[PDB]
Design an enzyme around this catalytic site. Structure first.
Site, PDB file in Angstrom:
ATOM      1  N   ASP B   9      77.765  40.967   3.442  1.00  0.00           N
ATOM      2  CA  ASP B   9      78.621  41.277   2.301  1.00  0.00           C
ATOM      3  C   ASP B   9      78.547  42.714   1.806  1.00  0.00           C
ATOM      4  OD1 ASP B   9      76.164  40.991   1.096  1.00  0.00           O
ATOM      5  OD2 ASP B   9      77.016  40.001  -0.679  1.00  0.00           O
ATOM      6  N   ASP B  14      72.733  45.301   3.716  1.00  0.00           N
ATOM      7  CA  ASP B  14      73.556  44.684   4.755  1.00  0.00           C
ATOM      8  C   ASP B  14      73.787  45.652   5.887  1.00  0.00           C
ATOM      9  OD1 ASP B  14      74.894  41.958   3.532  1.00  0.00           O
ATOM     10  OD2 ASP B  14      74.551  43.505   2.003  1.00  0.00           O
ATOM     11  N   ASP B  39      79.122  41.150  -2.440  1.00  0.00           N
ATOM     12  CA  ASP B  39      78.455  42.336  -3.001  1.00  0.00           C
ATOM     13  C   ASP B  39      79.085  43.641  -2.505  1.00  0.00           C
ATOM     14  OD1 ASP B  39      76.587  43.405  -4.740  1.00  0.00           O
ATOM     15  OD2 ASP B  39      74.901  43.095  -3.351  1.00  0.00           O
ATOM     16  N   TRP B  82      77.493  46.956  -8.506  1.00  0.00           N
ATOM     17  CA  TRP B  82      76.806  46.723  -7.236  1.00  0.00           C
ATOM     18  C   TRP B  82      77.789  46.706  -6.078  1.00  0.00           C
ATOM     19  CZ3 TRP B  82      73.243  41.964  -8.480  1.00  0.00           C
ATOM     20  CH2 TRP B  82      72.354  42.331  -9.498  1.00  0.00           C
ATOM     21  N   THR B 136      73.622  37.619   5.600  1.00  0.00           N
ATOM     22  CA  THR B 136      73.018  38.515   4.624  1.00  0.00           C
ATOM     23  C   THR B 136      73.835  38.593   3.347  1.00  0.00           C
ATOM     24  OG1 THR B 136      73.993  40.475   5.642  1.00  0.00           O
ATOM     25  CG2 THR B 136      71.819  39.829   6.400  1.00  0.00           C
ATOM     26  N   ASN B 185      72.772  35.747  -3.736  1.00  0.00           N
ATOM     27  CA  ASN B 185      73.585  35.274  -2.627  1.00  0.00           C
ATOM     28  C   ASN B 185      73.931  33.802  -2.760  1.00  0.00           C
ATOM     29  OD1 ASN B 185      73.632  37.770  -1.499  1.00  0.00           O
ATOM     30  ND2 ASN B 185      72.220  37.316   0.184  1.00  0.00           N
ATOM     31  N   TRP B 259      66.082  43.475   1.325  1.00  0.00           N
ATOM     32  CA  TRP B 259      66.277  42.034   1.481  1.00  0.00           C
ATOM     33  C   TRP B 259      66.867  41.681   2.856  1.00  0.00           C
ATOM     34  CZ3 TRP B 259      68.746  44.346  -3.002  1.00  0.00           C
ATOM     35  CH2 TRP B 259      68.227  44.003  -4.254  1.00  0.00           C
ATOM     36  N   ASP B 260      68.024  42.273   3.148  1.00  0.00           N
ATOM     37  CA  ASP B 260      68.787  41.884   4.324  1.00  0.00           C
ATOM     38  C   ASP B 260      68.190  42.517   5.560  1.00  0.00           C
ATOM     39  OD1 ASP B 260      70.405  40.683   2.496  1.00  0.00           O
ATOM     40  OD2 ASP B 260      72.093  42.068   2.768  1.00  0.00           O
TER      41      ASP B 260
HETATM   42  O1  LIG Z   1      70.362  45.525  -7.584  1.00  0.00           O
HETATM   43  C1  LIG Z   1      71.171  45.051  -6.769  1.00  0.00           C
HETATM   44  N1  LIG Z   1      72.150  45.861  -6.242  1.00  0.00           N
HETATM   45  C2  LIG Z   1      73.064  45.353  -5.324  1.00  0.00           C
HETATM   46  N2  LIG Z   1      73.001  44.105  -4.924  1.00  0.00           N
HETATM   47  C3  LIG Z   1      72.047  43.282  -5.403  1.00  0.00           C
HETATM   48  C4  LIG Z   1      71.757  41.948  -5.144  1.00  0.00           C
HETATM   49  C5  LIG Z   1      72.504  40.997  -4.195  1.00  0.00           C
HETATM   50  N3  LIG Z   1      72.210  41.194  -2.739  1.00  0.00           N
HETATM   51  C6  LIG Z   1      71.736  42.549  -2.344  1.00  0.00           C
HETATM   52  C7  LIG Z   1      71.385  42.386  -0.878  1.00  0.00           C
HETATM   53  O2  LIG Z   1      72.530  42.735  -0.073  1.00  0.00           O
HETATM   54  C8  LIG Z   1      70.976  40.909  -0.711  1.00  0.00           C
HETATM   55  O3  LIG Z   1      71.737  40.250   0.312  1.00  0.00           O
HETATM   56  C9  LIG Z   1      71.257  40.243  -2.076  1.00  0.00           C
HETATM   57  C10 LIG Z   1      69.936  40.019  -2.845  1.00  0.00           C
HETATM   58  O4  LIG Z   1      70.084  39.129  -3.957  1.00  0.00           O
HETATM   59  C11 LIG Z   1      70.706  41.638  -5.924  1.00  0.00           C
HETATM   60  N4  LIG Z   1      70.327  42.706  -6.628  1.00  0.00           N
HETATM   61  C12 LIG Z   1      71.125  43.735  -6.337  1.00  0.00           C
HETATM   62 CA   LIG Z   2      73.813  41.296   1.275  1.00  0.00          CA
END
Ligand SMILES: O=c1[nH]cnc2c(CN3C[C@H](O)[C@H](O)[C@H]3CO)c[nH]c12
Ligand SMILES: [Ca+2]
Ligand SMILES: O=c1[nH]cnc2c(CN3C[C@H](O)[C@H](O)[C@H]3CO)c[nH]c12
Ligand SMILES: [Ca+2]
Ligand SMILES: [Mg+2]
Ligand SMILES: [Mg+2]
Lengths: 326, 326
Positions: B9, B14, B39, B82, B136, B185, B259-260
C-alpha cells in the site's frame, strides 16, 4: 562577486536558497551562514548547512565559510511537523557521503563556537566591502544586530533581502488564534520584524507572499531534476523539492512554495524581480493579525522594496542550471 | 528462487520491502505487484512501484512484472498525511531518471489495464510453481481472492507473509474512540483481515507489532546509506528511511518502524525470525478495539505463524547489503 551572508531557519527552501547562493560564485561570495531555531530544530539545521557546504566544497568552487547557531528564541514557534524537515535532510544519503561528512566532522568544532547573531554582526561589520544579508527565516538576528550596533551594523549592509510578510495578499499563518493575514517568518518574531522594517538607513528588499505565490513547487518541475542525477546538487535540490510536492494535497491551493529560493535567486540576479517602495510596519500586538506586515502612512517612515511579478521561468531555469554545478 | 507477489500500500517501508524482494534475485523471483489505496494515494503508489521496477530493470537485469492497482476501498481510511509519502517518492530524482521513466511510460498503460485484485488471483492461480504473497498493506486483496476463488486460490499459495496486527503488545491506531490495541493495516479493513486469518488451508506468517517493534527506523543506521551512494538502491532506500526518522520526535516512543521491510526480509530468508502458531481472530464490530488481532479459543481454528524474536541485526545488515545490488 558580492559578499553575502545567509540567515536561514533550515527548512527545505532555506537549503535550496543556500545551494543557489553557494553555486553562483561569479555573482555571490557566500561568506557565512547562520541557522535559527525557527522552522527547524537548530542542531539539525546547523548540521545540514555544514553537510551541504562540505558537499559543495568537495566538488566545486566554494571556499568554506563560518556557520553559526543563532541564540534567537521564538515568540510564536513553528509547527513541530514543519520543523522536522532538517532532521530528515540530516539523514539523507546525498548529505552523508563519507568524504563530505568527514570534512564536516573536522570543521565542526570551530563552527560550534559561534553564536549566530554575533557572527552575523561580525561578518557584516568586518567585511571590507558591504555585505548583502539574505534572510530566509525570521528577522530576529538582523534585529539583534540593529539593536546592539545600530548604524555601525546597518552602514555595512548593502541590502537585506528578506523572505517574509504578505502585503496585498493573505498570509499563511492559519491558527485558531489568527486571522490569516500574517506570514510565518514575521509571525515567529513580530517585534524583531518591526525593528527591521522600521530601521532607517537599512536598504530592504522584501519577498513577501505577493511574489512568492508565483512559484509553487510543482511535480513536473521537480521531476526535471531526475534528468540531472549525474549532479549531486540535482539529487539534493530535487530531493528537497520532492519532499514538499504533497503540501498542496493537504492544503488546497496553499502548498509549498520556493519562497526562500526565489529570494536567494534575487540576490544572485536582480532580474528575478522588479521592486516597489512600500513603507512597511508590523503588527506586534497579541491580536488575531499579530505578525501582519502592513502599509503605514506614517510621515518619513522608511521604505522597503517589495518584489513584484517575479520572473518565475528565469528563476526556475536558474535553479535547474545552478544544480548542475556539481 | 521462489515466486513472490508483493501486495502493498505504497508507504515508505512498502517500497523498501519491494527493493529488498527485488534485489534478492537468488532467493526471490518477483512476478507481480499490486498497490492499494490505503497508506498512499494509489496512483502515486502505482507510479512509484513502476519507477522502482524500471530502475532495477535497467540497472540490475531485474525482469519486468505486471503491476496492478487494487480497487479495494477503506473501511477505516489512513491519515492523509501518511498517504502523501508516495507522492513525494514519485517526484524523487532517483526515480525520475530518463531511461527509467521512458520505460515506465512505455509499459505503464498495459499495467493500468489490470485490476489489482484480479492480478493477484491470476498470478497465483496461473503460476506453474506456488506463489508466496508478501502482504504489506491491508488484507483486502487476499480476502477478495479468498472470497471469489476459495480453495482454487488458496491451494496455489505457498504462504502469505503478512505485515499486520498486534498480538501481545499495544497496537498503533490511536484516536479517542479506539483503545490503541489495533494495528493500522488490520484496522483499515477488519473484515478482510478476519477472512484471511480464519481461512483454512492457507499458510500465514504474521509480522505483527510484536516483532516489528524491534526495528525502529533510526538516524545512525539510516545515515549508513550515505556510505553507499555509489549504489542507486542505497540512494533510494536511504532517502525513504530518511523521510521517516523524525516520526519518533512527533510521537514519543511511537515512531516509524521497518514494518514491511522486516516482513519482506523474512520472505528473502526465514532465518529473520522464528514463528509460533497462534489462532488469530479479528475484531470487526464497532468496538474500541475494532481491528484488533486476538487469540481465539475456537475449536479447530486455523493457525497463523506469528513472528517472534526477530534477528534485528541480521535484518539491518541484509537491507544494507541488498541496497548495494546496484
Ligand atoms: O507513522 C506512520 N506513517 C505512515 N504509515 C503508518 C502506519 C501504517 N503502515 C505503515 C507501514 O507501511 C505498515 O505496513 C503499516 C504499519 O501499521 C502506521 N504508522 C504509520
Ligand atoms: Ca504498508
Ligand atoms: O508548509 C510549510 N512547511 C514548512 N514551512 C512553512 C512555512 C514557513 N517558511 C517556509 C520557508 O522556509 C519560508 O521561509 C517560510 C514561508 O512562510 C510556511 N509554510 C510552511
Ligand atoms: Ca525559511
Ligand atoms: Mg572532491
Ligand atoms: Mg480495550
Amino acid at each position: 562577486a558580492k559578499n553575502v551572508v545567509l540567515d536561514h531557519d533550515g527548512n527545505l527552501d532555506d537549503f535550496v536558497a543556500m545551494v543557489l547562493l553557494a553555486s553562483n560564485t561569479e555573482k555571490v561570495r557566500l561568506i557565512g551562514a547562520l541557522c535559527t531555531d525557527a522552522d527547524c530544530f537548530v542542531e539539525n539545521g546547523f548540521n545540514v548547512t555544514g553537510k551541504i557546504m562540505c558537499l559543495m566544497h568537495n566538488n566545486m568552487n566554494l571556499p568554506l565559510f563560518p556557520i553559526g547557531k543563532s541564540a534567537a528564541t521564538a515568540v510564536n514557534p513553528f509547527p513541530k511537523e514543519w520543523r522536522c524537515l532538517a532532521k530528515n535532510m540530516d539523514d539523507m544519503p546525498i548529505l552523508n557521503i563519507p568524504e563530505n561528512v568527514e570534512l564536516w566532522d573536522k570543521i565542526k568544532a570551530e563552527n560550534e563556537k559561534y553564536e549566530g547573531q554575533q557572527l552575523l554582526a561580525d561578518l557584516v561589520m568586518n567585511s571590507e566591502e558591504k555585505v548583502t544579508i539574505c534572510v530566509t527565516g525570521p528577522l530576529s538576528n538582523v534585529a539583534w544586530c540593529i539593536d546592539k550596533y545600530g548604524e555601525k551594523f546597518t552602514s555595512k549592509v548593502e541590502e537585506c533581502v528578506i523572505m517574509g510578510g504578505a502585503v496585498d495578499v493573505r498570509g499563511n499563518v492559519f491558527l485558531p488564534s489568527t486571522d490569516g493575514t500574517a506570514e510565518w517568518n514575521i509571525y515567529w518574531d513580530p517585534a524583531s520584524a518591526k525593528t527591521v522594517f522600521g530601521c532607517p538607513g537599512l536598504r530592504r528588499i522584501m519577498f513577501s507572499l505577493d511574489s512568492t505565490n508565483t512559484v509553487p513547487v510543482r511535480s513536473p518541475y521537480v521531476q526535471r531534476f531526475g534528468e540531472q542525477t549525474n549532479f549531486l546538487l540535482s539529487i539534493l535540490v530535487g530531493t528537497m523539492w520532492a519532499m514538499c510536492t504533497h503540501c498542496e494535497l493537504l492544503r488546497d491551493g496553499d502548498g509549498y512554495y520556493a519562497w526562500d529560493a526565489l529570494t536567494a535567486a534575487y540576490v544572485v540576479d536582480q532580474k528575478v524581480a522588479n521592486v516597489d517602495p512600500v513603507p512597511i510596519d508590523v503588527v506586534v500586538d497579541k491580536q488575531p493579525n499579530e505578525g501582519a506586515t502592513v502599509r503605514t502612512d506614517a510621515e518619513n517612515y522608511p521604505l522597503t522594496f517589495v518584489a513584484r511579478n517575479p520572473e518565475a521561468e528565469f528563476f526556475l531555469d536558474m535553479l535547474l542550471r545552478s544544480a548542475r554545478a556539481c
